[model samples]
Each structure stands twice: as structure tokens, then as C-alpha cells.
Target chain A: DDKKTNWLKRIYRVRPCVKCKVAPRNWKVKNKHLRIYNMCKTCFNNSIDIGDDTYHGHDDWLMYADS
Target chain B: DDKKTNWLKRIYRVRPCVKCKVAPRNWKVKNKHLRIYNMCKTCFNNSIDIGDDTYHGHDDWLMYADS
Candidate 1:
């Protein structure tokens, strides 16, 4: 719905959220879905899923691959 | 400089503290001496200076290299 991906490509000339992985640990339990692995407490608490699109949204539903 | 430079040079290598760049987002207003850099909150809170001599202790005296 949003052209944020293109804007990100143009402005800083690269993806912004590309580096923005989901946070780790249950600090805030924001990683409630458990997609990202071993994220710091602070990072996990502040993470946001940008759009409701299934591809991105399901990341939250995905499980952390066991180490 | 103390032959500590060689001490830093020997053992595990070139220097342990070499990569020890200063922190950022100071929870403490440590830029008072203000040289190393914008250190992290935890680092600034617990930072230490060794050997009260002109070269090292005084890097704190150096100004922040701002743009």
C-alpha cells in the first residue's frame, strides 16, 4: 500500500528496515511471535511490524530457528 | 607513553583497547573532558582512565571532532 520501500531506496539509497530485524528476548515480550532470534531486550520492545501484509506480518508468526 | 603500548602490542595483539572506541548516547555528561566520543550509557557510567599523564588522560581534553 505504501511506497516506503521505494522511498527508502532513494533517500539513503538503500533499504532502511533491511537491517531492522525483529528484537529478541521477552523484555517487553514484543517478540511475542518469536520470529527474530536473540534480540536485545531494548530492541525487541520497540520493534514494529510496518504493514499488515501477510508476507511481512507472518514474520512475527515465524519461529526462531533453533541453534 | 608507557611501554604499555608494547604490552598492548604483545599478548593477544596490536592492542586490546584499540577497538575500544568511545561510547555514544551518554547517560552521563562525560563529554566534560569530552574527547573519546559519544559513548553508550553503560560504558560512560563505568568508564575509567588510567595513568594520569599528558598523552592518554588528556585525550579527554581534546574536543569532539564535530562536522
Candidate 2:
């Protein structure tokens, strides 16, 4: 209804994969269990959760809340 | 010059990339310390080309201002 929320929604609609910055259509996904989101392709592929916790960890984009 | 120096020191109090707070990890096998200061990897890659360079082309996460 408002432009602020409208643009916010529009922007988040097509965000890049945090790890790789690749923006796909509908194939993007997230690691909800880890509270991570907006991943695409090999990013989601290489998401070894427990191993990541063991390793260096991740970079969070941490934008506005979900719609 | 004094005010500019003061302002820059103030700005740098919260030391991290203006874009993705990618943490203070070593880069390129040590022996160097660079990038992510004026321009980070992701920010450089994005390079919005607006030419008004500052904080990955935007900002509002000012958080603490007067500190």
C-alpha cells in the first residue's frame, strides 16, 4: 500500500545469494535451521552446517525482517 | 584538516567494512592488510557506478551516532 514497504518488498524479492551473489528465479533457498537465507546454486549445495560451525563460519547479510 | 581528521577517526571507531561486516579476518595469507577499508570485495564487485561512492552505495545503519 505504501511506497516504502512496496520498494522494500520489491528489493527483497530479488536478492542475491549471500555467498555467491547469484540471483536466480525461484531456485533460491535458505538454511532456516541456521537462520540463514537467500542462497542459490552451489551456495546451498556447499552448505555443510555442522562443518561450517566447525570451520570459519558465514557472512550474514542480515537485512530487514521477513514479509 | 583537524576537523577532517577528527571526523575520520570518529567514523573509524566502529571498524568494519561499510557494507558486509565481514569481520577482521586475515587476508591473502598474511603479510598484508588491505581492501575493505574504502572498498570491500562485495562492494567492489557490485560497483553500482553511481559514482557518489560511500558505504557500498548506501547507508542508514548508523546505530550509535554520538559515541
Candidate 3:
């Protein structure tokens, strides 16, 4: 049980995945389900869902979506 | 241009890594570059450097390293 909870702790301290090193430069902005996505083409497609509402923090966006 | 700048907005949430729920239970405390890390072994070893100044927000850690 300790091992499982331990790793979850590391998932904290997240930066925007767009600025993430692994993400490709220039993320594509296409509307998905009405909300526009500023996500990398790969993560948008691959979708690394770490957890439910807990993992992806969507409310406090840093800037307006690229027009 | 708009696409590249868009995703950077999404990466700015500060949550305790422990509450993540998906991570392993026990983490090993090791020193890297003289700084103690309470990180999952996988992220530590893989070294996915997102951005130098922007991505990792380590100055605001939520806990002490495992003792």
C-alpha cells in the first residue's frame, strides 16, 4: 500500500504540459467537445490521463487560448 | 504561432503529489544535484526535463523527504 501512495505524491508540482519538454513545439488548437484544446498533438491523441479531476487541473488557465 | 503559445497556459496547478492516487506507495529518498527529492523513482531516473525555469516549480514543495 505504501508504494502506491508514494508515487502519487510525485505527480504533484505539475507545469503546463504544453511547456513540457516532451511535448512537440507548437501544440495544435482544435476544438474538442466544444472546449478548445491547447494540447500537443501527441498528448491530445495519446491522452496521458493520470487520474480523474485530480490530475488535470483545468480552471486556472494561464493565458487565452491561441486564436 | 498561436498553437505553440496555447498549451503553456494549462501546466500551472500546484497540488501535493501524494494525493495523486495513482503513484506507487513508497518512495525512495535520494539526493540529486545535492537537493533531496521525494520523487517517484521512474520520473527521477527518466529525467523528463520540461523547461528550465518554467516547467518545474520545486521551490514550493509540500513535504519533507521520506526519512
Best model per lDDT: 2
Candidate 2 chain B — worst ten consecutive residues by lDDT sum?
A: B58-67
Candidate order by DockQ, decreasing, is: 2, 3, 1
Stronger candidate by DockQ (1 vs 2) = 2
RMSD of each: 18.8, 16.1, 18.1
lDDT of 2 by residue, B14-61 (tens): 455545566331122112111114346555556566554564322211
In order, candidate lDDTs are: 0.27, 0.36, 0.29
- The sequence of per-residue lDDT tens digits that candidate 1 reaches over residues B1-67 is 2222232123213112322443233211243222222344354334544322222211122112110
DockQ numbers for every candidate? 0.01, 0.03, 0.03
Ranking of candidates on TM-score, top first: 2, 3, 1
Q: Candidate 1, A65: how far from true, in Å? A: 45
lDDT digits (tens) for residues B1-67 of candidate 3: 2332232222122222332324432232233111213343454444455322222223211121211
How much is A48 displaced in model 2, in angstroms?
A: 2.1
- The list of candidate 2 runs beyond 4 A from truth reads A24-38, A53-67, B1-67
